[PDB]
């Protein structure tokens, strides 16, 4: 039993990733709250089943990448869409999973690995395929699309394609033909990302990030152009306004962005599981990633979570996201 309830199989679920504690904090104040059972249940308070998969505080970056992104990259190279969503609050491990360190042989994230696998097929399988890897990097800040390359545009617009599906026109794209140029785009975009001035350790994301890898491949013999889009969406942080006390800072401004986008989130998995079509074209995020939210099921949601007095908040929301589907039999 329990399998028939997997009606959600929509895969569009959200794999849980717990980050481990470092020795400096095991006895500072932060202690385990995550009890793991098997390799797919996490007991936090009252909770008898979780969902599809829980990655423990012993799961490698490589291991997270295999389950979550490796298939999505494979499908993208055949001309399909895929989405990888990322979520988790401050000190949950987001920076460590998506990029990690830019050149680290096994501590590197998702984006440097995809970049390595892309250029390992290129020049080994190009004899009729002419590849152009185009990267685009933009943020949604105050629900306006701010391009993060070239000259920062404080707003940027969508237009519609041949099928009447929207896409971000004018988004500055650039060629990348080796891994280095991809890193240089990341360094450029992060240096203008809206980050709250906390202590140096904390990285409080107030702007949601969309990293586009557009795998354009051209075929030389009469067959035409393919264009797989991999949307790597780094969600900005969620912070419990009640506790922190936003009087007036980019706390209030972030609270409105993170809540509007997480709410649209809720409807999108619920629709991706079973509903009639609904809140598309509501926000710019939704306008950027729509074609993926309807077809090639590859919108892996990778939510982080670190034991402690904190992170329990954003972890909880990450679990509440794809928890309902078929109930039951």
């Amino acid at each position: 039993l329990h399998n028939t309830v997997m009606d959600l199989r929509g895969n569009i679920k959200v794999m849980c990733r717990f980050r481990p504690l470092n020795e400096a904090e095991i006895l500072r104040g932060d202690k385990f709250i995550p009890k793991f059972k098997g390799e797919e249940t996490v007991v936090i308070q009252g909770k008898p089943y979780v969902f599809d998969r829980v990655l423990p505080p012993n799961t490698t970056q490589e291991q997270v990448y295999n389950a979550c992104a490796k298939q999505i990259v494979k499908d993208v190279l055949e001309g399909y869409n895929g989405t990888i969503f990322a979520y988790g609050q401050t000190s949950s491990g987001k920076t460590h999973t998506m990029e990690g360190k830019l050149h680290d042989p096994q501590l590197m994230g998702i984006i440097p690995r995809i970049a390595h696998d892309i250029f390992d097929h290129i020049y080994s399988m190009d004899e009729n395929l002419e590849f152009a890897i185009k990267v685009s990097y933009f943020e949604i800040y105050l629900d306006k699309i701010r391009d993060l390359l070239d000259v920062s545009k404080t707003n940027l617009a969508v237009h519609e394609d041949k099928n009447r599906v929207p896409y971000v026109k004018g988004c500055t794209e650039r060629f990348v033909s080796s891994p280095e140029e991809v890193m240089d785009v990341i360094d450029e975009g992060k240096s203008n990302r809206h980050v709250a001035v906390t202590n140096m350790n904390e990285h409080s994301s107030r702007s949601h990030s969309i990293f586009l890898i557009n795998i354009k491949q051209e075929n030389v013999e009469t067959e035409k152009k393919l264009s797989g889009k991999l949307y790597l969406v780094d969600l900005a942080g969620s912070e419990k306004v009640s506790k922190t006390g936003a009087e007036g800072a980019v706390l209030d401004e972030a609270k409105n962005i993170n809540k509007s986008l997480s709410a649209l989130g809720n409807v999108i998995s619920a629709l991706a599981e079973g509903t009639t079509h609904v809140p598309y074209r509501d926000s710019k995020m939704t306008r950027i990633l729509q074609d993926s939210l309807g077809g090639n099921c590859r919108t892996t949601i990778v939510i982080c979570c670190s034991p402690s007095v904190f992170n329990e908040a954003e972890t909880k929301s990450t679990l509440m996201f794809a928890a309902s589907v078929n109930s039951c039999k």
């Binding site: 419990k240 809540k259 509007s260 997480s262 709410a263």
Partner: protein
């Protein structure tokens, strides 16, 4: 000895002006006499202004009248977090400035309207900030929880499942008076299809007078505020008893007024007279505080109650032998000169915790889900400094309030 009061939300303020009226009325202190002992909060000026323009205009200090010219918003979030926040400090200041001036107080009788913006949200953090600044006192909040079918706001439940969960871990005893179930009383026990809000207010304005006013007033069987929560709450959940009044007879129509105790007390347990659509559909009482006032012989009571204790169809909880706090005052009630209240020489304002609300909460919780189930007006709160957390996590909250009010009863 005293008990401050914070009337929050237009409603809590209308009811406030009312309860505040009945007061001087039975204390011989006309328009301009002494000095109140409460405050008024609202994020919509025009309403507190009514206390600044209308009657009982100069009986207050423009200092105990807090307003936020800004916006009310019939949404918890905004009133609690975002906007409501800005005012709170200032608000507190008075309940700390008015709390100091006195002499060994007992608590703050809070007046709010569960399903509002300024009433649900705001207070939520007002009572919140109190439970910490004066944990060592009484926090009896007098609420006007959501009409069972005749609600107003479209969101109401969002605002009331949220004022309950945030205040729950902060109140001492929460009195409840159902707006609709009071209308019935105005239709069935007074006859009038013309009940202005100004009436329901005169009513609670009565039942309330029986709580503080007269009780804090000498008598043959005094009952302190603490007394309540002690003799009234079996468990830490800021338990919510129900308010009921006895001689709710019409001062025009019928006239049997002279309705000796033996009668007015029986008239409290019949469900059609309790300012709450929580008809004892099964809810076993677990403690009642029969506050009497006027000419009453203790034996009359210690008999009229005895007769009741043995009606059985009035089934009291198991774990409770005797749950009847008999509060006797002297001075009879005091009806508005010419409203529509009979004016007897004795009354029974009995309040109690009844496993009955197992219902009322249920029916109000369910509401919530239906909408949350579709997020309905969710974007209105999120965009106001709230999250999927506060809702879902305040739903789970009440869930254990449906189990609580179930376990403490129905079982032996």
């Amino acid at each position: 000895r005293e008990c401050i009061s914070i009337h929050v939300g237009q409603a809590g303020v209308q009811i406030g002006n009312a309860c505040w009226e009945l007061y001087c009325l039975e204390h011989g202190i006309q328009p301009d006499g002494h000095v109140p002992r409460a405050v008024f909060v609202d994020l919509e000026p025009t309403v507190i202004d009514e206390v600044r323009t209308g009657t009982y205009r100069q009986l207050f200090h423009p200092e105990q009248l807090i307003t936020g010219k800004e916006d009310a918003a019939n949404n918890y979030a905004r009133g609690h977090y975002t906007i409501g926040k800005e005012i709170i400090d200032l608000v507190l200041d008075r309940i700390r400035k008015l709390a100091d001036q006195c002499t060994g107080l007992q608590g703050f009788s809070v007046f709010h309207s569960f399903g509002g913006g300024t009433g649900s949200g705001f207070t939520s953090l007002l009572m919140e900030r109190l439970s910490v600044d004066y944990g060592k006192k009484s926090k009896l909040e007098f609420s006007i929880y959501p009409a069972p079918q005749v609600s107003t706001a479209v969101v109401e439940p969002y605002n009331s499942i949220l004022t309950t969960h945030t205040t729950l871990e902060h109140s001492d005893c929460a009195f409840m008076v159902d707006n609709e179930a009071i209308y019935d009383i105005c239709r069935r026990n007074l006859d009038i299809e013309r009940p202005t809000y100004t009436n329901l207010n005169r009513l609670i304005g009565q039942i309330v007078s029986s709580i503080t006013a007269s009780l804090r007033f000498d008598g043959a069987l005094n009952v302190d505020l603490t007394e309540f929560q002690t003799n009234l709450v079996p468990y830490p959940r800021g338990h919510f008893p129900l308010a009921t009044y006895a001689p709710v007879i019409s001062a025009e129509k019928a006239y049997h007024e002279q309705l000796s105790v033996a009668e007015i007390t029986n008239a409290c347990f019949e469900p059609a007279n309790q300012m709450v659509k929580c008809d004892p559909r099964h809810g076993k009482y677990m403690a009642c505080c029969l506050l009497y006032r006027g000419d009453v012989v203790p034996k009359d009571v210690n008999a009229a109650i005895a007769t009741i204790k043995t009606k059985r169809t009035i089934q009291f909880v198991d774990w409770c032998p005797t749950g009847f706090k008999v509060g006797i005052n002297y001075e009879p009630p005091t009806v508005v000169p010419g409203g529509d209240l009979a004016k007897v020489q004795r009354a029974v304002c009995m309040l109690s915790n009844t496993t009955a609300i197992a219902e009322a909460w249920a029916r109000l919780d369910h509401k919530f889900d239906l909408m949350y189930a579709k997020r309905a007006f969710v974007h209105w709160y999120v965009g106001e400094g709230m999250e999927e957390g506060e809702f879902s996590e305040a739903r789970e909250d009440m869930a254990a309030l449906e189990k609580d009010y179930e376990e403490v009863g129905v079982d032996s």
